[PDB]
Design a protein around this ligand. Structure first.
Ligand SMILES: CO[C@H]1O[C@H](COP(=O)(O)OP(=O)(O)OC[C@H]2O[C@@H](n3cnc4c(N)ncnc43)[C@H](O)[C@@H]2O)[C@@H](O)[C@H]1O
Length: 167
């Protein structure tokens, strides 16, 4: 469990690696993998689609069942579901959809959900299709998360820009 390796330490509790979060989950066997979700847990692409594909669609079946019973999440909110074959648990976190006008301050609330877990494998919330500036998402993560977060950044150019901008 939690076999993290090859990360660059950014702060006392935030680590970063240029990697596909799916390949990391398979190597690391984390207690918790974070999904960058929407409020309906419809895992249509990005991190969410990659995680769902790696669970052979079991994540989407489980998510549909949960939402049908319980209703949508709130923006900035989260829910723990099974991690299936990738992790013990998946923490589905809804960052704000900045491009659609949702309040970017909810990125703080989104990252605050990480603090209920001692160690997490995670992506940069809202930094893809939701349109938040990745450097900003990293800054909010560093300022908000107090537990141990291992960030997987798939794109090499972005990873280099994030590490350069942080260094
Ligand atoms: C389309 O629907 C989905 O996207 C919506 C949520 O959008 P988001 O902006 O919060 O998250 P996204 O996943 O787009 O990117 C977050 C960050 O992870 C990077 N990245 C992408 N794939 C990655 C991978 N396999 N491994 C590591 N890093 C990855 C991105 O380059 C970006 O920096 C929601 O509706 C959801 O169902």
């Amino acid at each position: 469990v939690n076999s993290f390796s090859g990360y660059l330490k950014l702060t006392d509790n935030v680590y970063i690696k240029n990697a596909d979060i799916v390949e990391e989950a398979k190597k690391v066997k984390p207690t918790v993998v974070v999904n960058a979700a929407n409020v309906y847990l419809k895992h249509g692409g990005g991190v969410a689609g990659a995680l769902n594909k790696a669970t052979n669609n079991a994540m989407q079946v489980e998510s549909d069942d949960y939402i049908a019973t319980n209703g949508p999440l709130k923006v900035g909110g989260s829910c723990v579901l099974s991690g299936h074959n990738l992790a013990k648990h998946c923490l589905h976190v809804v960052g704000p959809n900045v491009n659609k006008g949702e309040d970017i301050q909810l990125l703080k609330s989104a990252y605050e959900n990480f603090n209920q877990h001692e160690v997490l494998l995670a992506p940069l919330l809202s930094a893809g299709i939701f349109g938040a500036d990745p450097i900003h998402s990293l800054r909010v993560c560093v300022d908000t998360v107090r537990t141990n977060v291992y960030l997987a950044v798939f794109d090499k150019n972005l990873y280099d820009k994030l590490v350069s901008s942080f260094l």
